[PDB]
Amino acid sequence: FEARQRIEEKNKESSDYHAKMAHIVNTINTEEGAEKNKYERERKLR
Amino acid sequence: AKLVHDVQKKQHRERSQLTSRSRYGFLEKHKDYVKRAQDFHRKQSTLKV
Amino acid sequence: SPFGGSSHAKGIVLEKLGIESKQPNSAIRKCVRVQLIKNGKKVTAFVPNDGCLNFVDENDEVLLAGFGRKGKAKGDIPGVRFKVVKVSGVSLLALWKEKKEKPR
Amino acid sequence: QRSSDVNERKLHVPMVDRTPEDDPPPFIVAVVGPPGTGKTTLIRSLVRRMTKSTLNDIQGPITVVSGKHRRLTFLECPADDLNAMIDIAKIADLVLLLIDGNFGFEMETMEFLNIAQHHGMPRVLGVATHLDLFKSQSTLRASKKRLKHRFWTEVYQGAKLFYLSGVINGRYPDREILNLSRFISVMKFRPLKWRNEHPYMLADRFTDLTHPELIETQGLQIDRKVAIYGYLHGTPLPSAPGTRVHIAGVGDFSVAQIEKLPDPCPTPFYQQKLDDKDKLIY
Amino acid sequence: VDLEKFVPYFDTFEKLAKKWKSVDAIKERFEYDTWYELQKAKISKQLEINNIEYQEMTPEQRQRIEGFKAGSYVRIVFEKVPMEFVKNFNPKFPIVMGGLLPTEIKFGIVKARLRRHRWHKKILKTNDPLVLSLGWRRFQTLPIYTTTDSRTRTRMLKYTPEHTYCNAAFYGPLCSPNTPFCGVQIVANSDTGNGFRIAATGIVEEIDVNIEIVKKLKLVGFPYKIFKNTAFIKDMFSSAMEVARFEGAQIKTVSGIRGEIKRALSKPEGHYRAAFEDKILMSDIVILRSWYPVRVKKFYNPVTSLLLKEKTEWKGLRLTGQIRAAMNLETPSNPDSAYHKIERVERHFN
Amino acid sequence: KEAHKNAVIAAREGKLAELAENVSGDGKRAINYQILKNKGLTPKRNKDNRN
Amino acid sequence: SSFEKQQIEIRKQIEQLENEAVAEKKWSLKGEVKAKDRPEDALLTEELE
Amino acid sequence: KMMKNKRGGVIDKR
Amino acid sequence: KYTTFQGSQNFRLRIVLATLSGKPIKIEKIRSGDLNPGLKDYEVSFLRLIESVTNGSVIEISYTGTTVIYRPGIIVGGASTHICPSSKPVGYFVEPMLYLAPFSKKKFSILFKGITASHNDAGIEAIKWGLMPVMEKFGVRECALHTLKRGSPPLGGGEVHLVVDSLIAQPITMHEIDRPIISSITGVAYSTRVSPSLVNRMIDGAKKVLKNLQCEVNITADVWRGENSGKSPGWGITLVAQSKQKGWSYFAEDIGDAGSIPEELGEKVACQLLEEISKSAAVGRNQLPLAIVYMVIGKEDIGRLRINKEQIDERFIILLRDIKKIFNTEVFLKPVDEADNEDMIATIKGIGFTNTSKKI
RNA sequence: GGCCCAUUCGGGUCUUGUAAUUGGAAUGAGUACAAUGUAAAUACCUUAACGAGGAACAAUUGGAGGGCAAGUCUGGUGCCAG
Ligand SMILES: Nc1nc2c(ncn2[C@@H]2O[C@H](COP(=O)(O)OP(=O)(O)OP(=O)(O)O)[C@@H](O)[C@H]2O)c(=O)[nH]1
Ligand SMILES: [Mg+2]
Ligand SMILES: [Mg+2]
Ligand SMILES: [Mg+2]
Secondary structure (H helix, E strand, O other): OHHHHHHHHHHHHHHHHHHHHHHHHHHHHHHHHHHHHHHHHHHHHO | OOOOOOOOOOOOOOOOOOOOOOOOOOOOOHHHHHHHHHHHHHHHHHHHO | OOOOOOOOEEEEEEEOHHHHOOOOOOOOOOEEEEEEOOOOOEEEEEOOOHHHHOOOOOOOEEEEEEOOOOOOOOOOOOOOOEEEEEEOOEEHHHHHOOOOOOOO | OHHHHHHHHOOOOOOOOOOOOOOOOOEEEEEEOOOOOOHHHHHHHHHHHHHOOOOOOOOOOEEEEOOOOOEEEEEEOOOOOHHHHHHHHHHOOEEEEEEEOOOEOEHHHHHHHHHHHHOOOOEEEEEEEOOOOOOOHHHHHHHHHHHHHHHHHHOOOOOOEEEOOOOEOOEOOHHHHHHHHHHHHHOOOOOOOOOOOOEEEEOOEEEEOOOHHHHHHHOOOOOEEEEEEEEEEEOOEOOOOOOEEEEOOOEEEEOOEEEEEOOOOOOHHHHHHOOOOOOOEO | OOOOOOOOOOOOHHHHHHHOOOOOOOOOOOOOOOHHHHHHHHHHHHHHHHHHHHHHOOHHHHHHHOOEOOOOEEEEEEEEEOHHHHHOOOOOOOOEEEEOOHHHHOEEEEEEEEEEOOOOOOOOEOOOOEEEEEOOEEEEEOOEEEEOOOOOOOEEOOEOOOOOOEEEEEEEEOOOOOOEEEEEOOOOOOOOOOOOOEEEEEEEEEEEOOOOOEEEEEEEEEEEEEEOOEEEEEOOOOOHHHHHHHOOOEEEEOOOOEEEEEEEOOOOOOOEEEEEOOOOOOOOOEEEEEEEEOOOOOOOEEOOHHHOOOOOOOOOOOOHHHHHHHHOOOOOOOHHHOOOOOOOOOOOOO | OHHHHHHHHHHHHHHHHHHHHHOOOOOOOEOOHHHHHOOOOOOOOOHHHHO | OHHHHHHHHHHHHHHHHHHHHHOOOOOOOOOOEOOOOOOOOHHHHHOOO | OOHHHOOOOEEEOO | OOEEEEOOOOHHHHHHHHHHHOOOEEEEOOOOOOOOOOOOHHHHHHHHHHHHHEEOOEEEEOOOOOOEEEEOOEEOEEEEEEEOOOOOOHHHHHHHHHHHHHHOOEEEEEEEEEOOOOOOOOOHHHHHHHHHHHHHHOOOOOOEEEEEEOOOOOOOOEEEEEEEOOOOOOOOOOEEOOOOOOOEEEEEEEEEOOOOHHHHHHHHHHHHHHOOOOOEEEEEEEEEOOHHHOOOOEEEEEEEEEEOOOOEEEEEEEEOOOOOOHHHHHHHHHHHHHHHHHOOOOOOOOOHHHHHHHHHOOOOOEEEEEEOOOOOOHHHHHHHHHHHHHHOOOOEEEEOOOOOOOOEEEEEEOOOOOOOOOOO
């Protein structure tokens, strides 16, 4: 019984952890990447 | 090597077989095991053919 | 100019985003959220390595500088354009080399 | 683009300074250095030129008026006690760091600088002494430069470092002390996180209020009722009794009674809003 | 009458209705250049409010609310002070009174990010006395230095890392996070020697009343019968009942061959069957990685230099190095643990 | 075992006395070379770079 | 005096801790434990993970 | 799992 | 030792104030002279909630049950479930947590189960639209109470999920010296396990009283039905007066009993809402103890809150005496310079509270 | 054995390497009896005595790569990959 509980908890924690890192990585790329590409366009305009 | 101390890149010395088990022989390490596994598979591959 | 005409921008360390990342010295661990003082705009910046992450803590001044990548690397997080060069008025490299101590 | 950069240097962490708008307490000046570097002679020299009166014996806090609106408290840190160096380093607004020029930096001098750096760096002034013991001008100039650059590593580059040559009648060169006494009055102090969040005071006087009869009928072993006096610092202390306090090196206690007293050394500018005459020592 | 009733008292419905046929009574209701200056303006603006409100108060009312302000010369009276303080009172030694916030009063487990000081010669050790300077207070504690193991657990270390920070947990009065501190091993003049004395530097990260530091505890057994993948192990467990607990546990050899504990063998006691991904050898050693809880020792020895006559020879718990020398005991050593050079003969197969 | 035990203790005590010899007779304590130059952590550099 | 009484109690704690640091560690604290080293049936107690 | 990380607890003497 | 209290009055506040201040308290003589002495079931359940959210605390209940000794620990929070006894609804357990949730080591994610409404305790929609907005003005940006199932009395069966994602050092200093202008009136009329017509019949009743007003009146009809409708039939309304200028809210609520006319309750609550507005200056009475406590636990700053002389009642006076016995802060009250009305400004200095549990 | 060219396979050339030991000579930074220097003095130039093997009389700054564990983490189609 303890074996069943431990494995389920480990999988859930592993699933949640991968969800968080994917979220914070994607949000950084999307929002900051926009600002970078925006700035790169202004510099090209100059 | 960028932003790494020399202390970080320190050789980790590797152990030996216990004295109580000294009769049996050399304590195999991962590199030693890899040589065995490849050798067996090479022979088994030809024997299968 | 990314900083509104300046080469370096003073900021406030709001949070260390990647503190919970399991993999040591990952690209995410070296990221810190910084609030630019000049306009209050929140931005994310790189730290040179996880070792220098210990020095950086919340609510301390940081001087930022552009982070230039010569070539694409597998693990980089594109979009983070800034790297921390000074914390509390002391060079972070100097702290990393133990040639100074951060004054609080 | 220098105009942009200079503006950046003005930008800092917003912070709240709890110094009252009127009648601030005296600033604490800590004279810290290894034994025999001349902490006592420096205090006497500074006390005389600001007050024009000489203290033959100095012990514990000494409050003097250094300016029209500026008041100063001196403290001689015991050089041989490390426990002392810790708790001065937490309250000292200004530290006069004594260094022996002939011998150079010492372990205790470094240790206090590292203690101070971790508890919030206060203003630190380097005072170089025993420069008369040198026999050559050439070696003296090199030692001064070497001492100055090392001191610039611990404290911001360009930090002011004072040079004292010799001692006459237990006093330093008069013209040299004046440059120091101004720089203490010119100094503008910084808001530090810990000092602006807790109340503390340097006991100016100590007195035992325990009744002598109690001492006899029970014995000296009986605990004592004590009163302490001193200016308050930092955040206001609550008026009501019962607040918890810690006395460094003694333990924790609760304020049994508290009462404000007239200032023994009121600043002159205060009296006038109501000069050699104006300068006072307590 | 009492706030346990969230709903407030109201008049009877009909009277409220008559009051509110007509609702005429209630009809009456229905640039700073830089962001830094804006924050400073907000601070200064609020600080202006305090002076205005206090000025409107009576002087007695001011003292009642704000208390005694800085700059006030004040007489504070204490009771139950130790008699040594008045007797062994040296005017040269300062007396610093420090007010305490409610957090400082509590005692518990303090979590700090701690490093050996760069100029300190030796690395600190776990469960090794250290005199700390937190807030207004100085005291001696027994810290435990730990590591995150890729942020999965709180594993106990043996010593501070040579040139980097490591999480430390020690028992003592609590303090707010962002409270820096320093540590010293020796405060007496007798043991000052010549070496640099500031031992540790760090910042408190978290305060708690409990902690679950854990230590890696590795069970070791040896094989005595090997059958291709399957193999029998011995010396890991002392009785079959122990094996019953660990059935299905993951194990590995030194060689890196992973395996599982399948079942306990009836004869002899403690032997069991394990299946490995590949054939193991007799020279190999099987290891079960297990974790054992560790507890922070509750030792609190506040430094009381002023109370002592010397005031400069305070001595508390001694290091593990010094205690051994006094009792003439040797540094414990394990012959198998030591490292030796090993020469590998070239491997050849039939 | 006692004979070897006494040997280890004696060797340790000799080292502590040798360390004690380093402390200067004058009470004044000087900063060592590490504090004075403050070179910190540096890579190993070939002597050829010196000139 | 009260302070002297407190000093005595701390002087009892200090001695106990001094022996503990000198004394050989429990089997659990020692890494790499074996069947012979530990007491019999100890694992049944510890409730390891 | 509830008892793992608690030092307090309700003490009911009724 | 212990700051001693008497009786059961302000039981939740005295524990919460003790937990916030960290000062141990002792409360004695709880229902001494009654036939049934000592703590009620809902009170002891309330205590158990504290240890689920605090760590290291020592609560000791005397043998007779009339005296309790509380030594507060550190707010730890976390995810948990609490089964609220039928003697009190979930709101009786929710509201004290709102004082503590922004001051935790980990976000509060508490699932309450039991009755979701009563005649004397805060309702779900009072907490959602009536108390949280007060916190939002105090700097708790993220707070929510999710209604998964409603449970009407006497059988209940409801469950609500309290989530406070916002953790802050201390509440922002308050400055409200004006009388907010009400832009609109909204509210939630709900029913369970009955015909939907009842909700409309209330909305007719409330609309009848409020139509004299010159502001919009839009009341939502939240009919609950199906598995999520609880186990007993019930219905009630809550009307909230909103001031969009500065996000201020006043509200009044009530639920319906067997044999009661839906139109009449809609008339009564809307009548009471106007009464509360008449009695309000910046925050209504049922909001005030939250506002008073939060200003006490602010920075070392002077907070100004305008209050009406009608608000300063026996409930107000007893609150302030309780605050001083723990915190020792005194609230000074000054009249306003205006002559059109009779308000007074409450000035309070925060004790410099800081959220020291949160890891950084 | 060292080095050079070459995607590939390979091709070209010869006193090279030491992570070894060792000798006596030379001199400046420095420290200084001096003199010169200068209103006096510092500095410079000159010069009695001392001043080199880790010549510890201990210049830096930046980059490119390796390799190691009964170590930790992640994903899988065992023994793999990151
Ligand atoms: N020649 C010379 N003597 C000095 C100098 N500074 C201090 N002294 C001497 O050093 C001695 C020490 O004087 P003190 O005033 O007692 O120094 P201190 O700071 O009080 O030392 P503590 O005993 O620890 O308090 C006196 O004889 C001083 O004349 C200096 O620059 N040159
Ligand atoms: Mg002296
Ligand atoms: Mg320099
Ligand atoms: Mg040679």
